[PDB]
Amino acid sequence: LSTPLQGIKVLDFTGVQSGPSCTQMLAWFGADVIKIERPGVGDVTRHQLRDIPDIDALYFTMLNSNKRSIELNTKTAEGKEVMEKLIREADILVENFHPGGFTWEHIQEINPRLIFGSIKGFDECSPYVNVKAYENVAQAAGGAASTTGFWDGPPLVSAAALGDSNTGMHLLIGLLAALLHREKTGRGQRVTMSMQDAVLNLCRVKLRDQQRLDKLGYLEEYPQYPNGTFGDAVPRGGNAGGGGQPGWILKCKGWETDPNAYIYFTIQEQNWENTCKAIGKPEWITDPAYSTAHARQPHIFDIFAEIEKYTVTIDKHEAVAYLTQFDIPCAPVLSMKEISLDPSLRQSGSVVEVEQPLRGKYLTVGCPMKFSAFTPDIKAAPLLGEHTAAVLQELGYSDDEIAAMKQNHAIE
Template sequence: MKALEGVKILDFTHVQSGPTCTQLLAWFGADVIKVERPGVGDATRQQLVDVPGADSLYFTMLNHNKRSIELNSKNETGKEVLTRLIETCDVMVENFAPGALDRMGFTWERIQEINPKMILASVKGFGPGNYEDCKVYENVAQCAGGAASTTGFRDGPPLVTGAQIGDSGTGLHLALGIVTALYQAQRSGQGQKVLAPMQDGVINLCRVKLRDQQRLKAGPLKEYSQYGEGIEFGEATPRAGNDSGGGQPGRILKCKGWEDDPNAYTYFITQAAVWEKICDLIGEPEWKTKEGYATPPERLDKLNEIFTRIEDWTKTKTKFEVMDICNPLGIPVGPILSTKEIIEDDGLRKTGTIVEVDHPKRGKYVSVGCPIKLSGSPVEVTRSPLLGEHTVEILREVLGYDGEALAKVVESGAVGDVNKQAAE
């Protein structure tokens, strides 16, 4: 049995934040019914297209294990179908612009009338307040959530990260909220609204930087490189380059081949517990007891010298050789893996973190699999649905339409060109 088997999700999401959430729920066994505009579908189907005539990777990699129904919610018959979907499903997930559901005639009060146990889960850019009606995208969320101001080097501009912490990060937060609300509904019999603002999600992921903001009141942040360089701190948490944020000094260092390979680097942490082993490794055994080097506080103003010396050693080894040598010694290091190396990693494929999926129109492609592993609910990643592929199936099996009633819905134009779908 799958963990969420029997749970029906009405998926009114598009682009990335919402689909990330519903895909995760689908991987855990929920029946996710993706509602899409007839003839158009999720906008990402046609964004960044690499195979003409096929759904883009942007869409396919965010919509595995779902079923698709085309539905015009502005059509009267479409409203009837949507009402029955709300009656039948356990959760409705949406990431429309603020007020869109209300304009469709499905306010929270109306949804509760239709199904008192319904959980309405929403992604919005900002929570209630001055900016709640503002439209937000990934990088805007990173900037408003504190990530950009604390990312990059001290003498450079703020930077956004390649990790989609605004979109996908918020989707993960929303998924947790939904599962929690489902658990409560089992005991209370009542649904509720679940809100995951993108700004809030980014702030949660940046909590250590808010920690450091408060620590500034007590004095300089000694684990930041600028302390050892004698540079004063300002009023806000500064950008710290590649310094470790956990109190143990760490940096990204060049490895063998860095001149030609932009990812020939390793992350190296000078953990206090293995300092003596590091000294032996890099050929500086006297640093183990030398005044100014023996203890972590003494080393803070010498981190540039220390990491330069360590880098002299790492540049003689590949990033994987650094791993092979340091791991048995307990020295924390990690290779800078490129996206190509990650896709080709046998270990990640074995665990299902990287999967290969076959699609009827684009052929085989590589995607990210479920990042969370449950021993009692294994995940099989299935391809994303074609637009409206399951329209008739959902109308019949989920909503009970058949015969004349089904024909009426099809003829109304509320569910796209069903006959063409059937012919294909």
């Protein structure tokens, strides 16, 4: 029908996760994403963590669906000529190389409408500008590790790709905003995004808590209050709510053996009565020590322990089925196994089955947001250099020229 980025052409040099997550979305929105890869090597994800010998790893297929692939040697003269032709026709160019001759200056000269997207570990004026960064390096520098985990444990890394995909989605936002901007200035521009800023942005609430702590010297809703101790910096709070509604991770039947036999339970301020009813503590409705959140805080864990006495008694799924009847905000801790087999996530398009050449079927996370005017069609990832010829043909090169370029490369 129509597609959001229909007609948009993307020059994609990204590798690994952050950059590829961004361009995979661009493709699902309708853009033609051309993955430019080193001849014979390609994106490292192609060979990292393989589950099957000699074929592209799931690391690759799950971050490169709907993309095209060309093998290009930018060093040669042939490659240099192909590169400029690509830049002239492109709408967007994306790269996420480590800190370590088509310059941004020359590129505007060549294509004043081109939007340059760049992902780095740190901002340009950062003292870590030249430091390489991987997922967890960014989580540590961004404030996430420092505030994740337990107060008597070390800083904890998060499973969520706060430093990659998260950074990829942020760049995606910038790219789309730049496309909207170009609609008015008729000009492209440069968009940069660091992994550190991505992490920091998701930790916005922790900077709020840091300021409350600098001012008051304590954080009322944190587990350290009021019998613990507060330092100069926001501490790890275990499985605390993290906002204005207290919560915790409660054990359910089977926890001794099943690492995922748990639920998250939220003590919602306006749902206190229903909560008391759900757990058979009607007396707590009027008891001064429990009728208010402020009054509950000091001994809130005795409340979690009382609720847990019931949860360890049944399967996490019955606990949720029972508790939600009282409008309690809660859910079971779903394992990746449960998620990979959930029917609704299949029906909602969250978990999508894809047929990949040479491999067969694999599962991937689909387009997160849903549109009423368009539905993305998630397809297989490209084999290395699968579209090299097609792209050169589109650039106007003849069959003899294409053959010669491949022959020179073979000889070289």
